[PDB]
Ligand binder design. Structure first.
Ligand SMILES: Nc1ncnc2c1ncn2[C@@H]1O[C@H](CN(CCCn2cc(C[C@H](N)C(=O)O)nn2)CC[C@H](N)C(=O)O)[C@@H](O)[C@H]1O
Ligand SMILES: Nc1ncnc2c1ncn2[C@@H]1O[C@H](CN(CCCn2cc(C[C@H](N)C(=O)O)nn2)CC[C@H](N)C(=O)O)[C@@H](O)[C@H]1O
Ligand SMILES: Nc1ncnc2c1ncn2[C@@H]1O[C@H](CN(CCCn2cc(C[C@H](N)C(=O)O)nn2)CC[C@H](N)C(=O)O)[C@@H](O)[C@H]1O
Ligand SMILES: Nc1ncnc2c1ncn2[C@@H]1O[C@H](CN(CCCn2cc(C[C@H](N)C(=O)O)nn2)CC[C@H](N)C(=O)O)[C@@H](O)[C@H]1O
Lengths: 343, 343, 343, 343
């Protein structure tokens, strides 16, 4: 299948085992911004669902399928590959919706649906939008979508902006400096110091922050889920040119995302921006191994390149340069294994 | 190999990727109780190492092999299956010990050693001793041990004791009762409340506690690494008969372990008991599905049965009854997915 | 002469030029602890001066000679090598003490005195006591001292103790990390980071601190000025063994000193300890390039080796070890060019 | 050599020892105005460097030579007399530019260069431009310059302006009045008050100030480095006639400087004016011994005579008079020993 061809079995087992836990579903369901905004997007656009055929990609517990039912959908095919599919069935029965919600266990790339659908609903967004590579499963499912069909969410915006945060930088650098010791219990570790710094700075930092640490207006990269093909997400190149609003040390790039549900009645936005109420997606920051100094008015240019790997994530290459001075920084980050810092 | 036969590839990949991180090695290296006691055990028993041939099973960074070198070992074969073997090799060279420490990348069940060894050193202990099933790799390595060879550690003691902790018990229902609501965004979730409760009770609880919650002297189960066979750890039956020192409700069993390095000069103990300074092993508690009431002087008898699975862990079956009343409780726990509760 | 043979002229020029400024004399005179304690020491032991012959080694403005006059000294030879000798003479005249204070311009190692003296007074103490190597001029002057003659100060105690101050450490490490940049205006500086670290940590830090940063009782090294010869100060070896009172990171050794004026009437102490009111000597700290971890009860052993150089200062070699673990640290410091951090 | 003949050795020793420190090179490098402007001047005039032969006088870390390399220089001679030459060589190697940059240890007046150059680059400016007398080394190097060759910087402007600062003036007496007391610990210090005052007034004051203390537009004295001879800087006579913009008491003259890089594409200016962002050169103020009252519209005329001395500095002689009133004041200052006042 398309899924297995792009996915290490080891990664898939772990991935679907994770979403098989009810405690994990609870955590997502209790993100009221997420759950409430999804419900608002669906119900406020009930005409896009009323008497329509629906596909829910990765239905989990089934909550989005239930929203579609509340909106009057004639039939909802709810696809889920983890064992959570069993629990969704339980809820469909106990909520007397067996006549409209049909759970189909399996990967959306592998199952067979009885008919084409009018609209696909899903929550395929991971950290920094692209983590988990579930967007590709979402786009893949368009093979079941009618020509006049819609997608909820319809588009995704990735925002990136330069930030200054000495404390975060020193916090990570301090960890790596363990490997700087010349005599840990009499053992010289210093030879691995380079490898250590490399390893720690490879971790994106997931948490939230004050918007005042941002040093320039964000750059936006848009994915149109109605137009995009699976293959478009294998290599994502995001060029940027920031016009620095403040002077100081740039310690890296901050990331967040918005998705829009573009319905017939209204467009509803779900935002994970630091200016908005916090979600379980928080925000993501990629540190430079060495900060770049820039003055207000300078331009910070470069590229954020995401290369999809078989562990359902991306290898992230960030190259940034202060155009006026030629000060350049590079880093490779592994989006699969971020550092969860929020407390 | 023996390893691959008892381990699902998926689990093995995840397992050795985990130990491939310098940060994970670091976390263990910074557990001073663990690292310091090993160093003391080896150095204070220098006659067990002086001019001897040593095998280090799962050398990680190589730290224990360096301790063996500090103790005067002639040659140390340091075996490591994760990519950490590369970093260990770097350290052996940078510490000018290539003539005495030989890093051998691969699983100890699969590599070939050039000669027999006088002593095996290792740190194969997981949560409640047996988690990760690395003890079987440690025992397996005895095929390279001379008839008079020693093992560091030499023995392992697992202790179990009944505890009362009303707050821990109730906490499970507080979390599960999330699902006991008739209209979460219009959805009746109550049907899954039972499954949620079950899921929470299947998790052993990793954290520490006040020793005053213990209701009886611990029962001890000893593994003699000099005598035990790999197969002995596939099914571990720990019968118990506790003599209650206090009256109250028993909410489950608490676990911890000790290992002893029985050397020619002295015996050194490494303990993770709740009476001792905390380690990264903390302690482990398994709840009963229903608490058992016992008064001081009563006996709580039953069995803790540990069944090895291919996910490098154990299925835990606990059955207990208050003999004087016949009140009975049981639980089935999955040691692979513990709940890390420590704050 | 003894002075010129041990001193590079360039250093001597700068040295005596420095003390030729009235603003510098003012700065020392306004150290009230210093000035008040000296007057205290001399006047309360007036019997050690009454009708006695006195030598003031490096009289500067002449302040100590005036104290000796106030205490009833019959004749004071005030030796001063800088141009300050001219100003001291002005003060002697304006204070009508020409019959009692005799200024003798020149280095104490070179001038000729008409007679032997009963007591020598001086203020030869520098940073960490020994800086400036004036103690050797003070000891050299005993060639003019009568048998059984006295010296003010009579003895000097150097104290050293291990300290923890993560903030100071990172402050110095941050500065050196400038040379960590791989693209400073497009230039890779990283090749010089080792040299930068070596240079910055070579600087003793002159400032004060809260006594709570000290991790063990101080070790004391005593110089008896009545007994010592100048040659004793060419190589000063200070062994130490600290019994750690607290667990934590040892970032270096803190230094301070006391001198005692052991007179016939009473003993007066001048202390620059952090437990005492601040003087212009403050305290001195020598950082390790990498801190050593120790738990309470451990012993920190090693040697502080001071080698006098021809620049009127010392090359400082510190080697320290946590005995229980073998964790070892070394540093080379240049006492001549300290980092002034206070306020 | 020319250098040794004009420099007392002790001063030279101290001078080049000072610049042998990475921390001092760093301080200059971290002055973004200085470093950024040099880079801009060189790169924006790339036609003046492309395939050219370059001489860098006093290359220090080598930073300006790398800029020349960025601009396309065919070959760069980097001359440095301090031990910093070793570190520059390291950077040349680590930046793979050994084929283009040649580090030459030694004084530019003493080394031998194999060929003539197209352009000389350097940063020889000190306090009030002329301090350190490195400009003479810069001009001396033109013996290696082709007739059609250029100089970067091309010209240097020293600016002078009268200022009022009652607090600064009074400050000198407040400090000197320490000595005006009849019993400092029993000593009459009054006799040295005059000498103390004189001492303070001989020190030019290095710091910055509010431009509002300036009472007239500056007078400019220009040195054209393309035209000037080394000997021109031995005696610098700067006549001035200020047209007073404000009425009040003039307490002295303020100094600052500009340099211009006159390239084929554009002229780039580096300014240390008090109207511009602060640099490590700050500004310099020389007091009159007695203030002069002047009215708006009056003219303050006189001479600032700079006389080079053997300590790589200048004796500053200032004479000024209010023409309309005939009120006259003078001062003689020692630029070698300035008072660093900046807070
Ligand atoms: N190819 C496929 N075929 C069928 N089913 C598939 C599939 N790929 C994934 N799934 C399934 O999709 C579900 C996605 N999950 C939403 C996950 C989005 N997300 C990311 C994060 C943060 C971070 N990335 C993380 O890993 O936690 N939090 N939520 C739950 C959303 C669902 N709508 C719900 O409400 O419960 C999961 O249950 C998963 O098993
Ligand atoms: N069959 C095999 N062949 C070769 N190498 C093998 C192997 N099986 C395991 N290993 C390797 O053994 C190492 C064990 N690890 C110690 C890990 C033990 N541990 C348990 C826990 C408790 C809990 N379960 C947890 O996960 O933290 N924490 N650490 C490091 C020990 C190291 N010598 C040290 O003392 O620093 C790991 O690096 C692992 O890759
Ligand atoms: N061989 C010699 N022959 C003749 N005269 C000599 C001499 N060596 C030094 N001197 C002279 O001795 C004076 C020492 N100075 C006190 C110096 C002690 N000190 C150290 C520091 C801190 C630091 N080490 C520093 O100042 O660099 N501050 N004061 C002043 C002491 C005098 N009692 C006074 O009160 O004014 C200076 O005036 C110096 O010129
Ligand atoms: N005759 C000679 N032959 C060979 N080399 C020589 C020389 N004379 C001086 N030098 C050397 O010239 C260098 C000048 N220095 C710039 C220093 C000038 N400066 C003055 C001030 C102001 C004030 N006077 C102060 O020093 O505080 N700040 N920097 C570094 C400039 C460097 N290229 C840079 O721009 O990064 C120094 O390293 C010095 O050793």
């Amino acid at each position: 299948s398309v899924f297995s061809e792009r996915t290490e079995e080891s990664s898939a087992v772990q991935y679907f085992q994770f979403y098989g836990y009810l405690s994990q579903q609870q955590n997502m369901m209790q993100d009221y911004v997420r759950t409430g905004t999804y419900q608002r997007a669906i119900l406020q656009n009930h005409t896009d669902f009323k008497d329509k055929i629906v596909l829910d990609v990765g239905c989990g517990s089934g909550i989005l399928s239930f929203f579609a039912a509340q909106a009057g959908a004639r039939k909802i095919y709810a696809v889920e590959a983890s064992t959570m599919a069993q629990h969704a069935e339980v809820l469909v029965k106990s909520n007397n919706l067996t006549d409209r919600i049909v759970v189909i266990p399996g990967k959306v790339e592998e199952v067979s649906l009885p008919e084409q659908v009018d609209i696909i609903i899903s929550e395929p967004m991971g950290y920094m939008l692209f983590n988990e590579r579930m967007l590709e499963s979402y786009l893949h499912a368009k093979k079941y979508l009618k020509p006049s069909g819609n997608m909820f969410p319809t588009i995704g915006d990735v925002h990136l902006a330069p930030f200054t945060d000495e404390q975060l930088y020193m916090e990570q650098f301090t960890k790596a400096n363990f490997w700087y010791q010349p005599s840990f219990h009499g053992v010289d570790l210093s030879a691995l110091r380079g490898a250590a710094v490399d390893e720690y700075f490879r971790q994106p930092v997931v948490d939230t922050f004050d918007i005042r640490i941002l040093m320039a207006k964000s750059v936006k990269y848009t994915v149109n889920f109605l137009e995009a093909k699976e293959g478009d997400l294998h290599r994502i190149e995001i060029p940027f040119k920031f016009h620095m609003l403040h002077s100081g040390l740039v310690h890296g790039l901050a990331f967040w995302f918005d998705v829009a549900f573009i319905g017939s009645i209204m467009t509803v936005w779900l935002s994970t921006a630091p200016t908005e109420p916090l979600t379980h997606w928080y925000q993501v920051r990629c540190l430079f191994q060495s900060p770049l100094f820039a003055k207000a008015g300078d331009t910070l240019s470069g590229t954020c390149l995401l290369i999809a790997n078989k562990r359902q994530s991306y290898d992230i290459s960030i190259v940034a340069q202060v155009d006026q001075t030629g000060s350049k920084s590079s880093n490779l980050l592994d989006l699969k294994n971020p550092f969860f810092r929020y407390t």
